């Protein structure tokens, strides 16, 4: 069955720090009977959009822990590197090991010229996706965690919305006492 709350979720956010493109998961043609034409998001739709802007994606990081949504070959056949990065389950935020894995991978690709984007997606494109992007911005790009979280909230509204995720990012990179409460969600979520 298609994931819950996916149909109304925007396919992509704005790019973050000129490098990361946050996305919800694509769903291949296997789900066409459950998804109306206007709401589809096959992998081809992402690559055709990038081609239309003369933009290349160097790497797509899939944080879903499943291969049931789309065919990784639809990404790889276009010359985009595909990585399935398994993250801590049970609703917990990504571990320090997961974040190191993500940073080790993305640092091999973030400095290409000409510039290319790194796509990042979980099922919906907000919590695991925003957590790992923020961790990279702080650890490798020297942004403050306040700036990272606020930029991700404006690029992919409403941003990270699990309060435990926000608190863990501030415990790791700032002052846990200053972590913001989760945002109030928009009506489309439910």
Ligand X SMILES: C[As](C)(=O)[O-]
6 touching ligand X, by CB under 6 A: no
Q: How far is the CB of 9 from ligand X (least distance, A)?
A: 7
Q: Which of 87, 93, 122, 134 is catalytic?
A: 122
176 binds ligand X (CB under 6 A): no
Pick between residue 57 and residue 93 the one whose CB is nearest to ligand X: 93
Q: Is 126 in the site for ligand X (CB under 6 A)?
A: yes
Residue 52, burial from CB neighbour count under 10 angstroms (0-12, 13-18, 19+):
exposed
- If one counts every other C-beta atom within 10 angstroms of the C-beta of residue 142, the result is 7
Exactly one of 161, 165, 170, 173 binds ligand X (CB under 6 A); which one?
161
* Closest separation in Å from C-beta 55 to ligand X: 25
Is 122 catalytic? The answer is yes
Residue 152 interacts with ligand X (CB under 6 A): yes or no: no
**Binding of ligand X at residue 141 (CB under 6 A)?**
no
Residue 74 to residue 55: CA distance in whole angstroms: 17
Distance between CA atoms of residues 6 and 24, nearest Å: 8
Q: How far apart are CA 170 and CA 173, in angstroms?
A: 5
Q: Is 154 in the site for ligand X (CB under 6 A)?
A: no
- The DSSP-derived string for 74-108 is HHHTTT-EEEE-----TTPPPPHHHHHHHHHHHTT
Of the two residues 101 and 127, which places its CB atom closer to ligand X in the complex?
Answer: 127
Determine how many CB atoms are found less than 10 A away from the CB of residue 111. Answer: 10
Query: Is residue 2 involved in binding ligand X (CB under 6 A)?
Result: no
Which residues are part of the catalytic machinery?
Answer: 122
């Amino acid at each position: 069955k298609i994931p819950p709350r996916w149909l109304n979720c925007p396919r992509r956010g704005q790019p973050v720090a000129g490098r990361f493109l946050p996305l919800k998961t694509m769903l291949g043609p296997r789900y066409d009977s459950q998804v109306a034409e206007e709401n589809r998001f096959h992998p081809s739709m992402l690559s055709n959009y990038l081609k239309s802007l003369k933009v290349k994606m160097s790497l797509l990081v899939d944080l879903t822990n499943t291969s049931r949504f789309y065919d990784r070959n639809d990404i790889e056949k276009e010359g985009i590197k595909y990585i399935k990065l398994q993250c801590k389950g049970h609703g917990e935020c990504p571990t320090t090991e997961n974040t190191e894995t993500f940073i080790r991978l993305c640092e091999r690709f973030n400095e290409r010229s000409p510039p290319e984007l790194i796509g990042v997606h979980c099922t919906h494109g907000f919590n695991r996706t925003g957590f790992l992007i923020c961790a990279f911005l702080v650890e490798k790009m020297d942004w403050s965690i306040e700036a990272a979280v606020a930029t991700f909230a404006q690029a992919r509204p409403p941003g990270i919305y699990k309060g435990d995720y926000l608190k863990e990012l501030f415990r790791r990179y700032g002052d846990i006492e200053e972590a913001p409460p989760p945002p109030v969600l928009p009506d489309w979520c439910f």
